């Protein structure tokens, strides 16, 4: 067979480096190019976290500033019980998603929180091209979808309960641009922007 | 009406009034985003409907054994063999006038004489 | 029905609930005392006997039919399950998590939980590898068919109970006064969890001249009916472009995204996937979550009762927001008179609950009940320090009187009248009776008229005349009922031959694709859907899938539905091929195969068998439902309505339909009728109550209805001295014995005004 | 007892029909 | 590894040698989403395989951009070894990998530092730009092979028929209900493990247990009836008759229903 | 019936009987019949029912 193409080798990873670390997969919920080496204030932070009562919480840089502040500042039992019998892997991803993978930049500008896709994770492999042009076989295990949160400043859930009440009356059709304009329950890009507005200034 | 969407978060577009202009500009409810309305149709409600009378014309919709097949000339390619159907929309005031798919070109003509 | 209840629903049920875990706490005041122990029972495979029986004296011996009739006693045999017992203990430190460890008290062990009745001529039943002198040895009648029980010396028929089928979407239009103008309601339902039914219904609330129409869903245990909106944002789909998307398939269809701008516009506010698991988790019913819980109280009930027959695990939000959003778009197809509602009587939707699946769930709640008797027992001996007797834990007579009690008496649960006493009347009233179905009837549709998709299926001519007619139907003499497959060799198979999985699924980068439900679970998408069915149907037709399996293809809607669950009524018919040595259709069975067929029939009365199942693993013969009827087109008869095209006026007037595009041809259409309407001769010149009338009466005739009734005590029986077959016989009732065992006398009859009397 | 379809009204039964319509 | 949320003592240094933050420097790495078929996904997904050997070779034709997999022979040799590479999408847009690691443990305005974070260590594998599937090539001899065993798939039954016991029935009841044969198992026996411990004393002397009880009594005020009785092995009786005369039960107080030393021997 | 095709209108389509009884009906035509039957009779039944409740 003529040579008129370029045959690169593909190779499998080694079992040893597989264990103690899982590869998944990440994929964001948007029309628009999302990429974390340019859109992302670095450095970047994943973790998985709680969603519980968001957009109360702190970004990185909120977070190193209130610790250099403060450290500016100090310097009858039942005896048996039925037992209901459960698989032990769907038990694990549960304990596993509880809390869900939450990525977060410096500043807060994106806050992304992922969902577990079920669908075809374990027909999922990866192909990552090497320097030399080879390819190198990842066993995908999880697939992640991601949704951006709190990028349109949204609101809470207790004032729009009374919102579905007919007690009041029609919706205003641009009711949270007022809100935007008054400056209350904004993003979490702009509440740390304020902070950091205002320790630069002192 | 052709309904359309912001480009930062995929929500729906509303009109909105503006006294710099008085021009007509969709607004985005969620992320403020303005753009330049292409017609001025912002509402349209039909009493009687005329979409939905030819619903489920695919690539193979000759391929349906239960369809009846005609002899009539289509009007594009000549070709005599064709399927036929009634109108799909289950109104109870429709009219009995029959859509014809040829099967050669997937060219769509009515019996409709009045039209015609 | 019973076979597959025996030989596989047992073995189901037995190891849905077959783990049984006790745990005992430590209790401990002082740390002394600080292991905690952990009690396992588990079942294992389950045995059943032949059938036999246990005296007074405690000796047990084969029991054979004609002795359990003679003796009133139950024909019946044994289940003995495999018990394994599991004892685990762990070091009770607090904080330390506990790791259980076997003490090797690891015994296992067949013991017995019950008697199951069997059916006359199943594969446990003697009667089965019987000949025919065996049956005369054992006084049991070879013209005798089985399909019944003997409860307490009594002949017991189960009378297959027709329901509505499960996971189908069903859209119907309410009343006027009512504020709700249409309703898609499905009956969500799964074979292999729980057996647990979940009505979810999406109803467009105000009516047509109204405008704010807005359409809300009644999910379970959620008192006020949600938003449609918030329950998408809920299911992980915040922005709206997306919301519609899953709803409305085509961008060009307006009218529909009109409709649904009310909607979007209503749970406005709520955008977030947190704040609208909120505002579902604050009508939760429980009345009893704390603050930071409802979220995951809310994610239960879109995990475990929000559609539970697509799936009942995490992470598959997807798909049941995709299923959402077709019931969203059916229910506004129906509302903007693209498609009618929903015919409630049309037989495709409908399913025959048989022998097995009836004894299926009552086996099921009884052997619920028993291991919860195991579990209280269990518990009582280790609360009050009793010792542990498996004798007394599992107490076989919940099982045998369960099963005993709702077969002797009509009633099934703890629906009566679903078993009856067997007609011994006739040979044709008893063949009548194991045939029979019955249709409970409170709604509102019209289940007392002849269907047009009961052709084939039921008898059109056979029903009381009482308040039961039209509810209680008769089986034409070809129409089977499936007894229902695994759908997940046919999903594995979809899924390796190009159906792209629904999350994946953008509706529009692929406008043209069709969707693929599977026992009406939407798992997908096709691209090519012609090449799919067409390999399907190869499939099925070389029997690589099970013949009971539809598969239907709705070209005009873009869908492929595959149902492979039990209950389908389905009639055999001939498969029309293109048949290019020819020029036209014609039908794949030819004359070889008639000659194979006949010589097998002549040596059962040496060459090779040539049976109806090599029909059907040949793709010569074909099983159809009513589901698959509605996609094919049927000739009458092979010579008339097959090749292309003076006449006698004697014969009656027939159209040959101008159509050559024929799928399949009838066998034969006397086998529309059932086994009564069957002995009508010439029934096409009667008028249609007249052979109602004989179908009724029939049942009421004299005959030998058994050939051994010198040895049955039978309540009541009637014999004519001098049975005679008729001069004037049908062809379908050679296959009914009406020859071997007739039901009357060819009499002289004179038609005349002879004295007045 | 028996099992007949020579249809026999039950008679003086109007009872059924009086709960058949016991709304107006 | 649990670990509390929104710490601002920096306790994440000393606890944590790992960095936290993720690394970025692998995000520039192409990586291909593959979609396997059933064998090749069951035997590229293995433990007891996959030891970094190189299972085949990618073949890029460029004059249509035409992707191919040339699989070795170490594998099998029923199975096809070409394959075609479908690109479902040239851009994949929105999609990256990223991989989690285990640290190591050894060495408006209104906010909570409490948020239940659970700290893992996370890097960018890379960039997904290519969707592919992999088909088996129409010309294998092997191809067959696969739709076969696809037709193999819908063909066989997972479960299997229940059994039928052909033995006499009287030998299958005779374990049944009233048998002679008496249980030998050990599963739960509570009044074996429970009735066999039995307690036997005597009337040893009135000086000997009051000096006993008022060393518990030293060691503890608060005593009970059936504590005292397993510490110094004495009759109930004999027990209750000393403790009225030196100690009373309390009926009201917080530690009621427990036998404690009198006030009048309370401040001995 | 499956054994017309879509939107037939036809008198045979719909349930016209053409032959009589002496020259035997064709299994459409059985069937068609076969519900008018059913229709009469379950009207009689209903019939008999309501009027027996009015007559009372
Ligand atoms: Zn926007
Ligand atoms: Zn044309």
Redesign the interface.
């Given at each position: 067979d003529p040579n008129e193409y370029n045959e690169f080798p593909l190779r499998a990873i080694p079992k040893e480096d597989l264990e103690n670390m899982r590869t998944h997969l990440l994929k964001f919920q948007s029309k628009k190019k999302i990429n974390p080496v340019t859109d992302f204030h670095l450095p970047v932070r994943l973790h998985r976290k709680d969603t519980r009562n968001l957009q109360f919480q702190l970004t990185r840089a909120e977070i190193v500033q209130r610790q250099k502040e403060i450290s500016e500042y100090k310097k009858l039992r039942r005896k048996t019980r039925q037992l209901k019998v459960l698989d032990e892997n769907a038990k694990k991803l549960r304990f596993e998603e509880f809390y869900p993978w939450v990525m977060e930049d410096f500043d807060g500008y994106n806050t992304w929180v992922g969902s577990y896709e079920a669908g075809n994770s374990d027909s999922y492999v990866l192909l990552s091209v090497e320097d030399d042009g080879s390819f190198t076989m990842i066993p995908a295990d999880k697939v992640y979808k991601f949704t951006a949160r709190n990028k349109y400043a949204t609101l809470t859930i207790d004032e729009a309960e009374k919102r579905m009440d007919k007690k009041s009356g029609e919706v205003p059709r641009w009711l949270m641009k007022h809100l935007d304009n008054i400056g209350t329950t904004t993003t979490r890009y702009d509440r740390t922007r304020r902070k950091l507005k205002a320790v630069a200034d002192q | 009406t052709t309904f359309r969407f912001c480009r930062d978060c995929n929500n729906m577009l509303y009109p909105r009034e503006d006294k710099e202009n008085n021009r007509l500009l969709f607004e985005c409810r969620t992320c403020s985003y303005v753009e330049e309305a292409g017609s001025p149709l912002v509402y349209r409600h039909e009493l009687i409907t005329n979409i939905g009378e030819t619903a489920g014309v695919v690539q193979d919709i000759g391929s349906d054994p239960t369809l009846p097949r005609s002899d009539r000339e289509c009007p594009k390619c000549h070709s005599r063999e064709n399927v036929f159907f009634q109108s799909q929309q289950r109104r109870k005031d429709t009219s009995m006038v029959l859509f014809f798919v040829c099967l050669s070109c997937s060219h769509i003509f009515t019996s409709d004489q009045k039209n015609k | 029905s019973f076979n597959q209840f025996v030989d596989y629903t047992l073995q189901d049920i037995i190891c849905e609930d077959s783990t049984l875990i006790l745990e005992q706490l430590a209790q401990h005041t002082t740390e002394s005392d600080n292991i905690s122990r952990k009690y396992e029972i588990s079942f294992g495979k389950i045995y059943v006997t032949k059938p036999m029986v246990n005296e007074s004296d405690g000796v047990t011996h084969a029991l054979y039919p004609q002795e359990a009739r003679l003796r009133n006693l139950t024909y019946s045999s044994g289940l003995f399950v495999d018990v394994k017992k599991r004892t685990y203990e762990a070091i009770d430190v607090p904080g330390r998590e506990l790791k259980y460890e076997l003490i090797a008290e690891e015994s296992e062990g067949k013991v017995f939980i019950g008697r199951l009745p069997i059916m006359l001529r199943s594969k446990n039943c003697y009667l089965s590898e019987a000949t025919e002198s065996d049956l005369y040895k054992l006084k049991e009648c070879p013209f005798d068919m089985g399909g019944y029980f003997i409860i307490n010396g009594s002949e017991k028929v189960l009378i297959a109970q027709e329901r509505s089928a499960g996971n189908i979407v069903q859209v119907f239009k309410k009343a006027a006064p009512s504020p709700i103008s249409h309703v898609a309601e499905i009956r969500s339902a799964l074979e292999k969890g729980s057996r647990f039914i979940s009505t979810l219904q999406v109803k467009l609330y105000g009516r047509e001249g109204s405008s704010a129409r807005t359409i809300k869903a009644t999910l379970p245990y959620i008192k006020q009916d949600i938003p449609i909106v918030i329950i998408f944002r809920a299911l992980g789909i915040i922005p709206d472009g997306e919301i519609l998307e899953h709803i409305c398939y085509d961008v060009n269809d307006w009218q529909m995204l009109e409709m649904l701008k009310p909607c979007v516009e209503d749970g406005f506010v709520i955008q977030d996937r947190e704040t609208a698991l909120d505002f579902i988790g604050r009508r939760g019913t429980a009345l009893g979550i704390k603050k930071e819980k409802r979220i995951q109280y809310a994610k239960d009930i879109l995990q475990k009762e929000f559609l539970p027959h697509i799936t009942q695990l995490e992470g598959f939000e997807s798909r049941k927001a995709f299923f959402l959003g077709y019931m969203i778009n059916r229910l506004l197809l129906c509302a903007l008179d693209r498609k009618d509602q929903d015919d409630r009587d049309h037989f495709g939707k409908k399913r025959l609950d048989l022998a097995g699946p009836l004894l299926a769930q009552l086996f099921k709640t009884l052997f619920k009940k028993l291991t919860k008797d195991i579990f209280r027992y269990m518990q009582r001996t280790v609360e009050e320090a009793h010792d542990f007797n498996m004798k007394l834990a599992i107490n076989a007579k919940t099982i045998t009187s369960g099963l005993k009690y709702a077969l002797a008496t009509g009633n099934w649960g703890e629906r009566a009248g679903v078993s009856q006493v067997l007609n011994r009347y006739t040979y044709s009233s008893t063949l009548s009776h194991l045939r029979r179905t019955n249709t409970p009837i409170g709604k509102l549709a019209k289940p007392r008229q002849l269907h047009n998709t009961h052709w084939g299926l039921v008898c059109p001519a056979e029903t009381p005349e009482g308040q039961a007619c039209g509810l209680v139907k008769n089986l034409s003499l070809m129409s089977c009922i499936s007894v229902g497959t695994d759908p997940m060799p046919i999903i594995t198979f979809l899924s390796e031959w190009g159906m792209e999985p629904l999350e994946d699924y953008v509706p529009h980068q692929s406008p043209d694709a069709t969707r693929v439900f599977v026992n009406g679970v939407w798992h997908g998408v096709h691209r090519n859907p012609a090449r799919l069915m067409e390999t399907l149907r190869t499939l099925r037709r070389k029997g690589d899938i099970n013949p009971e399996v539809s598969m239907i293809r709705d070209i005009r809607e873009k869908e492929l539905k595959i149902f492979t669950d039990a209950g389908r009524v389905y009639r055999p018919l001939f498969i029309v091929e293109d048949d290019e040595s020819l020029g036209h259709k014609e039908l794949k069975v030819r004359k070889g195969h008639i000659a194979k067929l006949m010589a097998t029939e002549y040596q059962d009365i040496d060459v090779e068998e040539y049976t109806w199942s090599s029909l059907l693993n040949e793709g010569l013969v074909e099983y159809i439902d009513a589901e698959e009827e509605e996609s094919i087109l049927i000739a009458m008869q092979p010579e008339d309505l097959e090749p292309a095209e003076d006449v006698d006026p004697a014969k009656r007037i027939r159209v040959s339909h101008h159509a050559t595009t024929f799928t399949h041809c009838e066998i034969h259409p006397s086998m529309i009728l059932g086994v009564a309407a069957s002995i009508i001769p010439f029934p096409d010149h009667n008028q249609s109550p007249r052979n109602t009338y004989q179908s009724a009466m029939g049942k009421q005739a004299m005959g030998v209805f058994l050939t051994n009734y010198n040895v049955r005590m039978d309540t009541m029986a009637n014999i004519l001295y001098y049975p005679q077959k008729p001069l004037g016989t049908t062809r379908a009732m050679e296959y009914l014995k009406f020859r071997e065992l007739p039901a009357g006398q060819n009499a002289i009859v004179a038609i005349a005004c002879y004295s007045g009397y | 007892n028996e099992?007949?379809?020579?249809?026999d009204?039950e008679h003086f039964?109007?009872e059924?029909?009086?709960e058949?319509?016991p709304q107006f | 590894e649990v670990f509390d949320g929104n710490d601002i003592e920096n306790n994440e240094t000393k606890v944590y040698e790992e960095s936290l933050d993720l690394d970025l420097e692998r995000s520039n790495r192409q990586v291909w989403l593959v979609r396997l078929p059933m064998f090749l996904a069951e035997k590229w997904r293995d433990r007891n395989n996959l030891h970094g050997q190189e299972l085949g070779k990618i073949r890029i034709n460029k004059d249509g951009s035409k992707i191919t997999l040339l699989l070795n022979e170490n594998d099998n040799d029923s199975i096809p070894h070409e394959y075609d590479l479908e690109l479902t999408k040239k851009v994949v847009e929105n999609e990256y990998v990223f991989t989690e690691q285990n640290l190591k443990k050894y060495q408006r305005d209104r906010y909570i530092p409490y948020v239940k974070t659970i700290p893992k260590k996370t890097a960018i594998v890379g960039t997904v730009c290519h969707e592919c599937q992999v088909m088996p090539s129409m010309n294998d001899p092997n191809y067959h092979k696969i739709v076969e065993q696809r037709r193999n798939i819908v063909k066989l039954n997972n479960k299997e028929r229940i059994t039928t016991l052909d033995e006499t029935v009287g030998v299958t009841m005779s374990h049944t209900g009233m048998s002679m044969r008496s249980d030998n198992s050990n599963f739960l026996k509570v009044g074996r493990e429970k009735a066999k411990s039995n307690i036997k004393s005597i009337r040893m002397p009135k000086k000997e247990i009051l000096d006993y009880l008022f060393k518990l009594f030293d060691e503890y005020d608060y005593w009970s009836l059936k504590g005292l009785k397993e510490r110094t092995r004495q009759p109930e009786a004999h027990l209750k008759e000393c403790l009225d005369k030196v100690a009373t039960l309390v009926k009201k107080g917080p530690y009621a229903f427990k036998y404690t030393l009198r006030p009048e021997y309370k401040k001995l | 019936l499956p054994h017309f095709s879509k939107d037939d209108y036809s008198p045979e389509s719909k349930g016209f009987v053409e032959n009589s009884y002496l020259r035997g009906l064709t299994p459409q035509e059985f069937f068609f019949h076969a519900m008018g039957g059913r229709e009469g009779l379950i009207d009689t039944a209903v019939k008999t029912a309501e009027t027996g409740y009015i007559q009372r």
């Amino acid at each position: 067979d003529p040579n008129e193409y370029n045959e690169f080798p593909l190779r499998a990873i080694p079992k040893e480096d597989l264990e103690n670390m899982r590869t998944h997969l990440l994929k964001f919920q948007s029309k628009k190019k999302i990429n974390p080496v340019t859109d992302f204030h670095l450095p970047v932070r994943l973790h998985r976290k709680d969603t519980r009562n968001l957009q109360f919480q702190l970004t990185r840089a909120e977070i190193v500033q209130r610790q250099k502040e403060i450290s500016e500042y100090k310097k009858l039992r039942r005896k048996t019980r039925q037992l209901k019998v459960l698989d032990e892997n769907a038990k694990k991803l549960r304990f596993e998603e509880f809390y869900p993978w939450v990525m977060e930049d410096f500043d807060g500008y994106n806050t992304w929180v992922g969902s577990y896709e079920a669908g075809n994770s374990d027909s999922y492999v990866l192909l990552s091209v090497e320097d030399d042009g080879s390819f190198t076989m990842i066993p995908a295990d999880k697939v992640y979808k991601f949704t951006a949160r709190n990028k349109y400043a949204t609101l809470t859930i207790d004032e729009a309960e009374k919102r579905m009440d007919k007690k009041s009356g029609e919706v205003p059709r641009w009711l949270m641009k007022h809100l935007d304009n008054i400056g209350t329950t904004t993003t979490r890009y702009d509440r740390t922007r304020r902070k950091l507005k205002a320790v630069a200034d002192q | 009406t052709t309904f359309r969407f912001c480009r930062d978060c995929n929500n729906m577009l509303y009109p909105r009034e503006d006294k710099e202009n008085n021009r007509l500009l969709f607004e985005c409810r969620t992320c403020s985003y303005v753009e330049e309305a292409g017609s001025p149709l912002v509402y349209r409600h039909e009493l009687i409907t005329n979409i939905g009378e030819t619903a489920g014309v695919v690539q193979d919709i000759g391929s349906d054994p239960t369809l009846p097949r005609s002899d009539r000339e289509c009007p594009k390619c000549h070709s005599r063999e064709n399927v036929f159907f009634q109108s799909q929309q289950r109104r109870k005031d429709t009219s009995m006038v029959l859509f014809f798919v040829c099967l050669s070109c997937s060219h769509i003509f009515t019996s409709d004489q009045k039209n015609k | 029905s019973f076979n597959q209840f025996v030989d596989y629903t047992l073995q189901d049920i037995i190891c849905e609930d077959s783990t049984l875990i006790l745990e005992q706490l430590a209790q401990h005041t002082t740390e002394s005392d600080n292991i905690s122990r952990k009690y396992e029972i588990s079942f294992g495979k389950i045995y059943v006997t032949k059938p036999m029986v246990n005296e007074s004296d405690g000796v047990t011996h084969a029991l054979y039919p004609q002795e359990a009739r003679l003796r009133n006693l139950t024909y019946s045999s044994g289940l003995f399950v495999d018990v394994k017992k599991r004892t685990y203990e762990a070091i009770d430190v607090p904080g330390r998590e506990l790791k259980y460890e076997l003490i090797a008290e690891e015994s296992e062990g067949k013991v017995f939980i019950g008697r199951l009745p069997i059916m006359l001529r199943s594969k446990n039943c003697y009667l089965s590898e019987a000949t025919e002198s065996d049956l005369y040895k054992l006084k049991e009648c070879p013209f005798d068919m089985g399909g019944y029980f003997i409860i307490n010396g009594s002949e017991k028929v189960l009378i297959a109970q027709e329901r509505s089928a499960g996971n189908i979407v069903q859209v119907f239009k309410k009343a006027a006064p009512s504020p709700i103008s249409h309703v898609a309601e499905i009956r969500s339902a799964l074979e292999k969890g729980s057996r647990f039914i979940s009505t979810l219904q999406v109803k467009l609330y105000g009516r047509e001249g109204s405008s704010a129409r807005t359409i809300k869903a009644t999910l379970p245990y959620i008192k006020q009916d949600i938003p449609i909106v918030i329950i998408f944002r809920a299911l992980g789909i915040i922005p709206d472009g997306e919301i519609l998307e899953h709803i409305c398939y085509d961008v060009n269809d307006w009218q529909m995204l009109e409709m649904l701008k009310p909607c979007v516009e209503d749970g406005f506010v709520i955008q977030d996937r947190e704040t609208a698991l909120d505002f579902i988790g604050r009508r939760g019913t429980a009345l009893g979550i704390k603050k930071e819980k409802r979220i995951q109280y809310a994610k239960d009930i879109l995990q475990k009762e929000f559609l539970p027959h697509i799936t009942q695990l995490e992470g598959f939000e997807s798909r049941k927001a995709f299923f959402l959003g077709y019931m969203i778009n059916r229910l506004l197809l129906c509302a903007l008179d693209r498609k009618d509602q929903d015919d409630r009587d049309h037989f495709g939707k409908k399913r025959l609950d048989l022998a097995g699946p009836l004894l299926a769930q009552l086996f099921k709640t009884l052997f619920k009940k028993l291991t919860k008797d195991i579990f209280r027992y269990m518990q009582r001996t280790v609360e009050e320090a009793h010792d542990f007797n498996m004798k007394l834990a599992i107490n076989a007579k919940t099982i045998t009187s369960g099963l005993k009690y709702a077969l002797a008496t009509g009633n099934w649960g703890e629906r009566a009248g679903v078993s009856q006493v067997l007609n011994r009347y006739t040979y044709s009233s008893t063949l009548s009776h194991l045939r029979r179905t019955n249709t409970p009837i409170g709604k509102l549709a019209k289940p007392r008229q002849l269907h047009n998709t009961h052709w084939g299926l039921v008898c059109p001519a056979e029903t009381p005349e009482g308040q039961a007619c039209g509810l209680v139907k008769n089986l034409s003499l070809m129409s089977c009922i499936s007894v229902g497959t695994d759908p997940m060799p046919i999903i594995t198979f979809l899924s390796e031959w190009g159906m792209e999985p629904l999350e994946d699924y953008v509706p529009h980068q692929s406008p043209d694709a069709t969707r693929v439900f599977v026992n009406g679970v939407w798992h997908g998408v096709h691209r090519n859907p012609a090449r799919l069915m067409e390999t399907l149907r190869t499939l099925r037709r070389k029997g690589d899938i099970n013949p009971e399996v539809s598969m239907i293809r709705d070209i005009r809607e873009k869908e492929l539905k595959i149902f492979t669950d039990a209950g389908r009524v389905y009639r055999p018919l001939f498969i029309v091929e293109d048949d290019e040595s020819l020029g036209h259709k014609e039908l794949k069975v030819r004359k070889g195969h008639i000659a194979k067929l006949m010589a097998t029939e002549y040596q059962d009365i040496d060459v090779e068998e040539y049976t109806w199942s090599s029909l059907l693993n040949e793709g010569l013969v074909e099983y159809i439902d009513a589901e698959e009827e509605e996609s094919i087109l049927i000739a009458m008869q092979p010579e008339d309505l097959e090749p292309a095209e003076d006449v006698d006026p004697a014969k009656r007037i027939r159209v040959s339909h101008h159509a050559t595009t024929f799928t399949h041809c009838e066998i034969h259409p006397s086998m529309i009728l059932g086994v009564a309407a069957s002995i009508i001769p010439f029934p096409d010149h009667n008028q249609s109550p007249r052979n109602t009338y004989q179908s009724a009466m029939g049942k009421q005739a004299m005959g030998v209805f058994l050939t051994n009734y010198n040895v049955r005590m039978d309540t009541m029986a009637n014999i004519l001295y001098y049975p005679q077959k008729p001069l004037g016989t049908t062809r379908a009732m050679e296959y009914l014995k009406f020859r071997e065992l007739p039901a009357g006398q060819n009499a002289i009859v004179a038609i005349a005004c002879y004295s007045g009397y | 007892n028996e099992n007949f379809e020579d249809f026999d009204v039950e008679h003086f039964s109007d009872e059924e029909t009086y709960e058949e319509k016991p709304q107006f | 590894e649990v670990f509390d949320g929104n710490d601002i003592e920096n306790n994440e240094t000393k606890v944590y040698e790992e960095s936290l933050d993720l690394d970025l420097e692998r995000s520039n790495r192409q990586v291909w989403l593959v979609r396997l078929p059933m064998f090749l996904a069951e035997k590229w997904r293995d433990r007891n395989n996959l030891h970094g050997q190189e299972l085949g070779k990618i073949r890029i034709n460029k004059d249509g951009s035409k992707i191919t997999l040339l699989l070795n022979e170490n594998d099998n040799d029923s199975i096809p070894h070409e394959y075609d590479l479908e690109l479902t999408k040239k851009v994949v847009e929105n999609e990256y990998v990223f991989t989690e690691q285990n640290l190591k443990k050894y060495q408006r305005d209104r906010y909570i530092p409490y948020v239940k974070t659970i700290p893992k260590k996370t890097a960018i594998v890379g960039t997904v730009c290519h969707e592919c599937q992999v088909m088996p090539s129409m010309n294998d001899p092997n191809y067959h092979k696969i739709v076969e065993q696809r037709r193999n798939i819908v063909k066989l039954n997972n479960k299997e028929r229940i059994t039928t016991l052909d033995e006499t029935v009287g030998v299958t009841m005779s374990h049944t209900g009233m048998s002679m044969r008496s249980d030998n198992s050990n599963f739960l026996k509570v009044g074996r493990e429970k009735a066999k411990s039995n307690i036997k004393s005597i009337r040893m002397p009135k000086k000997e247990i009051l000096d006993y009880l008022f060393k518990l009594f030293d060691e503890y005020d608060y005593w009970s009836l059936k504590g005292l009785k397993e510490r110094t092995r004495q009759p109930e009786a004999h027990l209750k008759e000393c403790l009225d005369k030196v100690a009373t039960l309390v009926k009201k107080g917080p530690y009621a229903f427990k036998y404690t030393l009198r006030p009048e021997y309370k401040k001995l | 019936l499956p054994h017309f095709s879509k939107d037939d209108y036809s008198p045979e389509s719909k349930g016209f009987v053409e032959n009589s009884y002496l020259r035997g009906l064709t299994p459409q035509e059985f069937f068609f019949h076969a519900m008018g039957g059913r229709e009469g009779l379950i009207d009689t039944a209903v019939k008999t029912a309501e009027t027996g409740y009015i007559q009372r």
